[PDB]
Design a protein around this nucleic acid. Structure first.
Ligand SMILES: [Mg+2]
Ligand SMILES: [Mg+2]
Lengths: 223, 223
DNA sequence: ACG
DNA sequence: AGCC
DNA sequence: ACG
DNA sequence: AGCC
């Protein structure tokens, strides 16, 4: 699938931030009304320190049937720095995306979207590139304040940055920690919560798109 | 300082567990009545993957004055496996301990004590070796159930393993995550909570013994 | 789930 | 713990 | 404090 | 994420 190379990836940390502050102004938070059909999930495993393995899984909704799965194994140069995950995992994801045949209605990333220091989490960032609605689903908090939701199956709270709602915390599985959901691009808080709740099956903590992308990222790595 | 080499460290994972199940029966949970004077804190940093740097800091209580500081830089063979931290960080700590001149009244370790699958966290394990009262203070949960304490300076809850109290969770600093305190050897839950509360200064999340051992483990590593 |  |  |  |  195609996309817009909005900028260079070979940037020193301090420069990436500058970029982030410019790209955030181009983000569009908008309702995603309707039932999506093709939903994608993205993730990366790391066979080596400087070697990543990105996987994208396209699912058929509401059947959750796997329709396509592409992957790209490559070098990872940029280090991990909270708030700059995009500059680390972004490039390899895009290379796997160049291999993607079916155009997704929505893409789910294993990371923050709006719930980010500069309001441009890896999900928002990629959305600008691929120009498709995106959602970020992280397994831990990066930014924002919240009241821990009850330990009940669909309990949830809002993630805040002061008075602004930047995402939500959903208990998708009792006994397990909540997940952090936030809009990427062409998405808003209410719609990302609705969609993520619809993409998560009973008994699972992680919504199908990213849950499967992860397993694949791990199976491909190992045997 | 001296200690008892109770067993070999070069053990395969499955064997270490066996050892743990035998050593746990020798643990003595007993009150630590009274004001201690010399309190030690232990920690390790890792200059390389197979290279550790252990530091032990002895403090004067209740002044928190540093009285002694010894360290040992060495190879780390055993990998990290939750529940077997002792087989990884234990050996190098003991080598630093062999260098220790002042005998501590109590030793605080950066890890679990009783709050462990086999009731023998690294703090309990070392206590058997050094035959001195020990306490474990971890920054995250390894085993047990608990109700998150209020976000207030001295708020705390009990850590459970069913009906058994195996430690406590203390909010030592509002806005920061709680710490997990559990008795090692020659210690009990009530006394370890009392002592750890006394060893933690206002505004700090980590009690002085281990807070200082950590900084040193990091400074020595770097410049 | 898990320094 | 270790990738700033 | 922070995949 | 990666050390089973
Ligand atoms: Mg991931
Ligand atoms: Mg430590």
């Amino acid at each position: 699938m195609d996309y817009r190379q909005l900028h260079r990836w070979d940037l020193p940390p301090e420069e990436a931030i500058k970029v982030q502050n410019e790209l955030r102004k181009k983000i569009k938070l908008t309702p995603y009304e309707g039932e999506p059909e093709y939903v994608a999930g993205v993730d990366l495993s790391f066979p080596g320190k400087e070697e990543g393995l990105a996987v994208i899984v396209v699912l058929e909704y509401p059947s959750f049937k796997i329709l396509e799965v592409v992957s790209e194994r490559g070098e990872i140069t940029f280090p991990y720095i909270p708030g700059l995950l995009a500059f680390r995992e972004g490039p390899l994801f895009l290379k796997a995306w160049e291999k993607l045949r079916t155009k997704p209605d929505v893409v789910v990333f294993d990371g923050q979207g709006l719930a980010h220091p500069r309001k441009l989490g890896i999900a928002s960032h990629m959305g600008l590139f691929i120009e498709i609605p995106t959602i970020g689903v992280a397994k831990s908090r990066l930014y924002g304040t919240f009241k821990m939701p009850e330990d009940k199956r669909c309990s949830w709270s809002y993630l805040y940055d002061g008075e602004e709602i930047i995402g939500c915390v959903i208990r998708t599985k009792e006994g397990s920690a909540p997940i952090f959901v936030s809009p990427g691009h062409l998405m808003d808080v209410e719609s990302s919560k609705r969609l993520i709740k619809a993409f998560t099956l009973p008994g699972r903590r992680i919504p199908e798109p990213t849950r499967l992308a992860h397993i694949y990222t791990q199976r491909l790595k190992k045997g």
